[PDB]
Design a protein around this nucleic acid. Structure first.
Lengths: 5, 332
DNA sequence: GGCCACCA
């Protein structure tokens, strides 16, 4: 989702 | 130059620059391309007049609903990006390597926002996305506001508690006094413990989670001195976990999970052990990652403020080198 | 942050 990473 | 990923010696030289640069980022390591195995790697670098690498950009190319790719250098390039004449040279090499296949090259380096820097980038033709946008954590791929603990402000600190006011010392002490214990490692055992707490937390929030193979590739790409999974238990019961990556000047708390029900402040114990790892290794920075706002209504700010009392860091955001402006306008 | 919550 998007926190990215 | 463009890095020949089939030349092992050249790849080693590239990796040595990334791993030893004060600007190094795990998401710019070539190991991140093994994690992002569904993206295509294209990597470029510059040399000084002495033959040494002085700047590097690791890109990953993703699909879009158009005929063009999205080129993305996550938390890169690895250099002082405010040196915009040097940046332009590096981006020029990147654009050569992309050979017209991408509509944009986006990079979101961890450099402080400033109005003078924003204007300089726009003057050099870049499109920037920072205070001009937002949607919070969704406005940009990576959060632009980040809770970062500067351990160099505490040169003599020996343990995590040494960093904190009394009220926070009490919160950190609580899980350990109530029997919480933390171990850590980077084997399949800790990964399975992480993944149970991670999927459990995702279901409780009704949210999507990454597949375990994502983390297995990351465990394959990064050894235990770089990647470490911290696991908090009480009387044998699994309570919470977190994944931290040590790279460049920082240890980054990246992923976490916690079980349903009473967890006895175990996530505080994970944070304490992660910060202790940063102290034990003389790491400058401990990064707890993104928040949506400096606010009491933001559950991310509220938790992370326990451990970061200074202002969140606000970065320059996304810097877009526009290559196909028609597709750029459609998708951005 | 307000024992309470937070605890991606």
């Amino acid at each position: 989702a998007x926190c990215x990473x | 130059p463009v890095l020949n990923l089939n030349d092992p010696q050249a790849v080693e030289r590239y990796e040595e620059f990334m791993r030893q640069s004060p600007y190094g980022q795990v998401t710019q390591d070539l190991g991140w391309a093994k994690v992002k195995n569904n993206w295509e790697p294209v990597d470029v670098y510059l040399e000084d007049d002495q033959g040494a690498i002085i700047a590097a950009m690791s890109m990953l190319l993703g699909d879009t609903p158009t005929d063009k790719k999205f080129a993305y250098a996550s938390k890169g390039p690895v250099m002082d990006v405010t040196d915009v004449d040097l940046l332009d040279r590096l981006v020029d090499e990147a654009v050569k390597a992309l050979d017209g296949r991408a509509y944009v090259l986006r990079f979101d380096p961890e450099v402080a926002y400033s109005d003078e820097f924003n204007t300089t980038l726009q003057d050099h033709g870049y499109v920037t996305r920072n205070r001009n946008v937002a949607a919070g954590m969704h406005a940009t791929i990576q959060p632009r506001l980040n809770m970062v603990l500067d351990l160099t402000k505490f040169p003599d600190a020996k343990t995590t508690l040494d960093l904190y006011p009394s009220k926070t010392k009490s919160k950190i002490k609580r899980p350990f006094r109530d029997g919480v214990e933390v171990h850590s490692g980077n084997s399949a055992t800790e990964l399975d413990e992480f993944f149970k707490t991670y999927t459990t937390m995702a279901e409780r929030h009704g949210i999507t989670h990454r597949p375990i193979e994502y983390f297995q590739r990351m465990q394959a790409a990064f050894d235990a001195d770089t990647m470490r999974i911290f696991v908090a238990e009480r009387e044998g019961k699994l309570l919470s976990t977190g994944i931290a990556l040590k790279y460049g000047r920082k240890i980054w708390y990246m992923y976490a999970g916690s079980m349903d029900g009473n967890t006895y402040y175990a996530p505080y114990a994970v944070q304490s052990e992660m910060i202790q790892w940063a102290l034990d290794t003389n790491t400058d920075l401990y990064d707890l990652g993104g928040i949506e706002s400096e606010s009491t209504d933001d559950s991310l700010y509220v938790f992370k403020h326990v451990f970061v009392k200074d202002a969140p860091r606000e970065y320059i955001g996304e810097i877009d080198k526009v290559l196909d402006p028609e597709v750029y306008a459609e998708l951005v």
